[PDB]
Each structure stands twice: as C-alpha cells, then as structure tokens.
Amino acid sequence: PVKLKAVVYALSPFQQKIMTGLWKDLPEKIHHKVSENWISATLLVTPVVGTYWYAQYFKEQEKLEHRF
C-alpha cells in the first residue's frame, strides 16, 4: 500500500449536467487533435496512398504498352 496524502472534493452525479461537455471547447478539442496527431496521421496515410497510386500507375502503363 502506497502512502498517499491528498484532499479530494467530489460532487454527486445527480447535481451536474451529463452530456453538454461533449460539445464544449470544441475548437480546442479539434485543434489539439490535429496539432498533436498530424505527423502520426501523415506517417500512416502517406505510404499506403503512395503505394496504391504507384501500383495503379504501373498497371495503366503496362496495359497501354501491351496494346497495338
């Protein structure tokens, strides 16, 4: 058992609004998600999309070069 010192004040669940917080600070929520995550998102999307587009281009070039 860890020895802890703290004071915790809590309000009853029936004295607070339950759902409005979903839509509060919404620009901050979007901004934090984008600014913290855009590198991770790039590192995930870029190789997949690039490989797919290159494969499509390869297939189109191969199809054209076999025609008459």
Added chain:
Amino acid sequence: IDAVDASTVKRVANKYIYDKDIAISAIGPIQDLPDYNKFRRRTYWNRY
C-alpha cells in the same frame, strides 16, 4: 415520542433516507473507504 411507531419510522426513513443523496467527510487512512457511488447505491434495496 409515543406517536412515533414502526410505520411512522418507515415513512420518515422513506422520506429522508431512501434513494437519497449523502454528504461524506473523511480523514486519515481512508483508501479502503468506498467511493461516493457505492455509498449512494447502498441507500436502496433492489430485492424489494
């Protein structure tokens, strides 16, 4: 006082205790003290 019979006690308890909010003040080594939700749930009996 004599007017307070068993049915009176139950009526008053249902007015003041049953499924009611509670206030808790605790100090010391109280990590094993149950949280507010557990105390709040124990204000009613679902077997009844």
